[PDB]
Amino acid sequence: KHNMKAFLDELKAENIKKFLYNFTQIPHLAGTEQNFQLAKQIQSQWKEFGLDSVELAHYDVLLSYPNKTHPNYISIINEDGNEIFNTSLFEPPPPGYENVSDIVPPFSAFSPQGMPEGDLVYVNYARTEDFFKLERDMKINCSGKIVIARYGKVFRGNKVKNAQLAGAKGVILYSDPADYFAPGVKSYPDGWNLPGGGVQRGNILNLNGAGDPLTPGYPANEYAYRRGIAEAVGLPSIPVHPIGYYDAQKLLEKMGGSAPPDSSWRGSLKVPYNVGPGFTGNFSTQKVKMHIHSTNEVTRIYNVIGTLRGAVEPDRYVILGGHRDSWVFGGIDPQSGAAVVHEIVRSFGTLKKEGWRPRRTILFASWDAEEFGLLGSTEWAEENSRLLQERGVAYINADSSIEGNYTLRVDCTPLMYSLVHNLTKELKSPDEGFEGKSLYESWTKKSPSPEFSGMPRISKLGSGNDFEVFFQRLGIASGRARYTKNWETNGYPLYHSVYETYELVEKFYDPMFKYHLTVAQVRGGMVFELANSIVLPFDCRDYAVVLRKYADKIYSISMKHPQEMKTYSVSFDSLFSAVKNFTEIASKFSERLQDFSNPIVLRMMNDQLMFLERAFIDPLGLPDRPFYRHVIYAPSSHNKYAGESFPGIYDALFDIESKVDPSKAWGEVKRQIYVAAFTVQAAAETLSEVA
Ligand SMILES: *[C@@H]1O[C@H](CO)[C@@H](O[C@@H]2O[C@H](CO)[C@@H](O[C@@H]3O[C@H](CO)[C@@H](O)[C@H](O[C@H]4O[C@H](CO)[C@@H](O)[C@H](O)[C@@H]4O)[C@@H]3O)[C@H](O)[C@H]2NC(C)=O)[C@H](O)[C@H]1NC(C)=O
Ligand SMILES: CC[C@@H](C)[C@H](NC(=O)c1ccc(F)cc1)C(=O)N[C@@H](COP(=O)(O)N[C@@H](CCC(=O)O)C(=O)O)C(=O)O
Ligand SMILES: *[C@@H]1O[C@H](CO)[C@@H](O[C@@H]2O[C@H](CO)[C@@H](O)[C@H](O)[C@H]2NC(C)=O)[C@H](O)[C@H]1NC(C)=O
Ligand SMILES: *[C@@H]1O[C@H](CO)[C@@H](O[C@@H]2O[C@H](CO)[C@@H](O)[C@H](O)[C@H]2NC(C)=O)[C@H](O)[C@H]1NC(C)=O
Ligand SMILES: *[C@@H]1O[C@H](CO)[C@@H](O[C@@H]2O[C@H](CO)[C@@H](O)[C@H](O)[C@H]2NC(C)=O)[C@H](O)[C@H]1NC(C)=O
Ligand SMILES: *[C@@H]1O[C@H](CO)[C@@H](O)[C@H](O)[C@H]1NC(C)=O
Numbered sequence: 001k002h003n004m005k006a007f008l009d010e011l012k013a014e015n016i017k018k019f020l021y022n023f024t025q026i027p028h029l030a031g032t033e034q035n036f037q038l039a040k041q042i043q044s045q046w047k048e049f050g051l052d053s054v055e056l057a058h059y060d061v062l063l064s065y066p067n068k069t070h071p072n073y074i075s076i077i078n079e080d081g082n083e084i085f086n087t088s089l090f091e092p093p094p095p096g097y098e099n100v101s102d103i104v105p106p107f108s109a110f111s112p113q114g115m116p117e118g119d120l121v122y123v124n125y126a127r128t129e130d131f132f133k134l135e136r137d138m139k140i141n142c143s144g145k146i147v148i149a150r151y152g153k154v155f156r157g158n159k160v161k162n163a164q165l166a167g168a169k170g171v172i173l174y175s176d177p178a179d180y181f182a183p184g185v186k187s188y189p190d191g192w193n194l195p196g197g198g199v200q201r202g203n204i205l206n207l208n209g210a211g212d213p214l215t216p217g218y219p220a221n222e223y224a225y226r227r228g229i230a231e232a233v234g235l236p237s238i239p240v241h242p243i244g245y246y247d248a249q250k251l252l253e254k255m256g257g258s259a260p261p262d263s264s265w266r267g268s269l270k271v272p273y274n275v276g277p278g279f280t281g282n283f284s285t286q287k288v289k290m291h292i293h294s295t296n297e298v299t300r301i302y303n304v305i306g307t308l309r310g311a312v313e314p315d316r317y318v319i320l321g322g323h324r325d326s327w328v329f330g331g332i333d334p335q336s337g338a339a340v341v342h343e344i345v346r347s348f349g350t351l352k353k354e355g356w357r358p359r360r361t362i363l364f365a366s367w368d369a370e371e372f373g374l375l376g377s378t379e380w381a382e383e384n385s386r387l388l389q390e391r392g393v394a395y396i397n398a399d400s401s402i403e404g405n406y407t408l409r410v411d412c413t414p415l416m417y418s419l420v421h422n423l424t425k426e427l428k429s430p431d432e433g434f435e436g437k438s439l440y441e442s443w444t445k446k447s448p449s450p451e452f453s454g455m456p457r458i459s460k461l462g463s464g465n466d467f468e469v470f471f472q473r474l475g476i477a478s479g480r481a482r483y484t485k486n487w488e489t490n491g492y493p494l495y496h497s498v499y500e501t502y503e504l505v506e507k508f509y510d511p512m513f514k515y516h517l518t519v520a521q522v523r524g525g526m527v528f529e530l531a532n533s534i535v536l537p538f539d540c541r542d543y544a545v546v547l548r549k550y551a552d553k554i555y556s557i558s559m560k561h562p563q564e565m566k567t568y569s570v571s572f573d574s575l576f577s578a579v580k581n582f583t584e585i586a587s588k589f590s591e592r593l594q595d596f597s598n599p600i601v602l603r604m605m606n607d608q609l610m611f612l613e614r615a616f617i618d619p620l621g622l623p624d625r626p627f628y629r630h631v632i633y634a635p636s637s638h639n640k641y642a643g644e645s646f647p648g649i650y651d652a653l654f655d656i657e658s659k660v661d662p663s664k665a666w667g668e669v670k671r672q673i674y675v676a677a678f679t680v681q682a683a684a685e686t687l688s689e690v691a
């Protein structure tokens with residue numbers, strides 16, 4: 001029999017392990033020859049695995065690299081201009097990799113060039129609320145200062161935008177052991193903790209979903225007309241550089257000016273965490289100087305696209321995608337996901353060789369340049385947007401399979417909640433103490449839902465990964481699943497460092513590759529069901545439940561301002577009405593879906609299921625973010641990684657007590673309530689009888 005069990009049983013932990021090892025021996029930085037060679041290898045193997053067609057789709061996009069002969073570094077400089085302390089030029093390479101070439105040194109991708117010299121201000125995590133505290137409460141002025149911020153809590157691009165808007169002239173990012181060193185575990189190579197010389201690479205763009213900075217809206221193909229650099233999307237205006245905590249200690253230890261305002265501003269280093277500006281009395285004339293010489297360069301990137309043509313509905317696409325490019329070895333990010341995809345393709349191909357085909361078409365993708373701003377997935381979706389929005393059933397992401405070994409973590413559209421519950425009840429838990437129990441049971445025990453007993457936590461989709469264009473721009477139902485850590489006893493310390501290797505995973509995270517296998521079963525099982533179930537496995541009623549929860553939430557934010565709501569007649573009545581209607585219509589649609597031999601009624605109904613996520617797209621986009629078009633979910637304006645619900649209303653309400661023209665500010669709240677109520681009602685109406 002060719003069924004989901006046959007698919008799942010064919011997956012092997014040992015294969016995943018072999019693929020991970022194969023993908024992590026050399027760096028695969030976007031735009032480099034090594035990553036093109038890997039793309040060609042994957043294309044060749046997916047063909048031998050049995051896919052119908054496997055092509056490379058290439059684009060020429062803006063990337064960023066350090067200058068090999070003019071290294072980036074930061075100094076403390078004395079009044080004579082002697083550089084008395086220099087940060088490191090590279091991370092000490094791990095055992096047995098000290099002779100590996102082409103390890104990119106730590107840098108912040110897309111930093112402009114410069115050599116700004118100034119007094120430091122310490123800004124905690126450089127969050128919106130951290131800058132509010134400095135500027136509003138502490139009266140500290142960042143204008144013309146070099147800001148030093150600890151990584152953590154929010155996407156680093158948002159930190160840089162926040163620093164830039166505060167008037168900073170440069171930003172130094174560092175990893176504090178409070179956020180990247182778990183008490184009682186040793187530093188790599190003896191444990192999974194970050195050494196003091198370890199440094200997190202990463203881009204600092206604010207693209208808001210645009211893709212390649214030079215071609216927003218359109219694929220960066222051979223004849224593309226590119227913006228000039230000055231009009232490019234999302235580039236920072238000030239130099240930025242990341243350092244480890246050995247170097248951070250040397251920069252912070254001399255800091256003077258005001259004390260930290262409270263303990264939430266103190267990390268774990270033996271320094272006072274003074275905010276500044278500048279250094280204490282004896283060192284008051286020393287300054288900090290950055291030296292950044294990285295260059296932005298249009299560079300070719302390559303996605304691998306594999307197709308397994310559907311037997312019955314070949315014009316319906318279920319997509320499994322994850323990136324291939326890495327900062328260095330990519331032992332977790334992304335190759336622990338890419339090895340899983342590879343094994344999933346292998347299993348589907350085994351079934352195909354025996355005469356099986358899925359009902360719908362399955363597309364498999366190995367995306368390039370994800371680390372430089374989701375560039376590969378976004379350009380390809382821009383090229384294929386018409387096919388995707390008329391034919392795209394679902395997108396399942398497949399980046400890092402593990403960031404811990406504790407329990408499952410799922411982020412998805414509500415349309416997939418029932419699918420995920422049902423699938424995980426049929427899978428075996430890999431956890432110690434749950435042998436013979438279902439993954440649903442272990443997951444539910446370890447990560448209970450905050451609102452429903454006997455159910456697991458499932459989070460919103462945020463952003464910062466390759467599902468963004470499919471979900472937030474095009475409105476295709478999207479999901480992701482990975483193994484995670486237990487937050488309450490404690491993402492991973494060695495993220496984006498040279499120390500993230502095959503050995504890290506094999507020694508400290510998943511020696512038996514059983515968590516990888518469980519993740520392969522969840523991702524692959526989701527894809528199987530989406531591509532094969534007669535009726536698409538989406539339950540519209542789960543969207544109705546969450547819509548009410550988000551409506552309650554946004555109403556409760558607004559209700560902190562009862563006087564203004566009276567003055568400006570701010571009512572949420574239309575939004576609750578739309579949600580009530582969605583609930584009623586979804587319930588009726590569900591009855592018909594179960595009560596309807598008619599392939600036209602079925603496909604009509606499958607089309608209503610597929611276009612339901614699509615109905616939440618507003619073609620005008622959110623304010624000043626034209627590529628975030630989903631009205632229910634957008635990446636938080638303060639942290640790209642986090643999802644925000646009813647983002648247009650949320651952002652209109654945010655910090656509203658500070659706006660100088662309240663009439664105008666509350667008018668825009670009302671406008672966003674109208675947009676949201678209308679979109680919910682329009683989405684509901686796509687589920688009504690069609691004529
Ligand atoms: C949720 O679904 C319900 C349907 O079950 C839907 O109800 C509709 O509400 C609208 C807006 O309230 C109703 O509009 C009315 O329509 C009549 C004609 O049928 C008009 O005469 C009304 O206008 C008069 O009264 C207004 C209010 O006092 C005045 O402002 C106006 O100047 C007129 O004097 C009014 O337009 C509509 O009839 C119902 N439809 C039904 C019951 O079928 C509701 O709108 C849905 N929610 C959302 C958010 O869409
Ligand atoms: C660091 C541990 C990781 C498993 C990680 N991080 C977080 O969950 C997280 C949350 C808050 C935070 F401040 C840092 C990390 C995580 O999953 N991050 C995101 C980002 O993954 P990626 O590194 O592949 N994406 C790139 C590029 C993102 C973009 O350009 O939009 C990046 O974040 O630099 C994700 O997987 O969706
Ligand atoms: C990763 O695995 C691939 C595929 O098995 C290896 O590439 C093959 O290498 C052999 C021996 O050099 C060649 O004869 C094949 O033609 C290659 N096949 C391809 C590219 O499809 C590759 O050597 C492995 N890499 C590492 C680091 O182990
Ligand atoms: C930090 O690095 C800088 C740059 O390499 C060093 O300063 C240079 O020292 C050389 C040799 O003494 C001089 O010829 C250059 O003129 C200096 N360059 C600059 C830009 O000042 C500096 O010595 C290093 N500091 C420490 C403590 O190692
Ligand atoms: C998840 O599984 C449940 C339990 O089997 C499914 O709900 C059943 O669906 C069948 C087939 O239409 C109905 O006859 C039953 O009445 C349903 N039982 C319930 C709601 O308790 C549900 O459809 C599955 N979800 C999917 C496939 O997305
Ligand atoms: C790198 O280093 C120096 C800086 O001027 C120069 O010789 C070379 O052009 C630079 N490479 C670039 C800017 O791409």
Ligand SMILES: *[C@@H]1O[C@H](CO)[C@@H](O)[C@H](O)[C@H]1NC(C)=O
Binds near residue numbers: 141142143144
């Ligand atoms: C902060 O610094 C500069 C002084 O160079 C000034 O122009 C700016 O208005 C100041 N802002 C505040 C809020 O003090």
Ligand SMILES: *[C@@H]1O[C@H](CO)[C@@H](O)[C@H](O)[C@H]1NC(C)=O
Binds near residue numbers: 192404405485508509
């Ligand atoms: C793996 O699981 C064990 C048992 O809970 C835990 O002590 C260890 O910290 C885990 N490893 C990682 C990398 O989280």
Ligand SMILES: [Ca+2]
Binds near residue numbers: 212217378382
């Ligand atoms: Ca583009």
Ligand SMILES: [Cl-]
Binds near residue numbers: 398
């Ligand atoms: Cl993922």
Ligand SMILES: [Zn+2]
Binds near residue numbers: 323333334370399400
């Ligand atoms: Zn990744």
Ligand SMILES: [Zn+2]
Binds near residue numbers: 333496
């Ligand atoms: Zn990454």
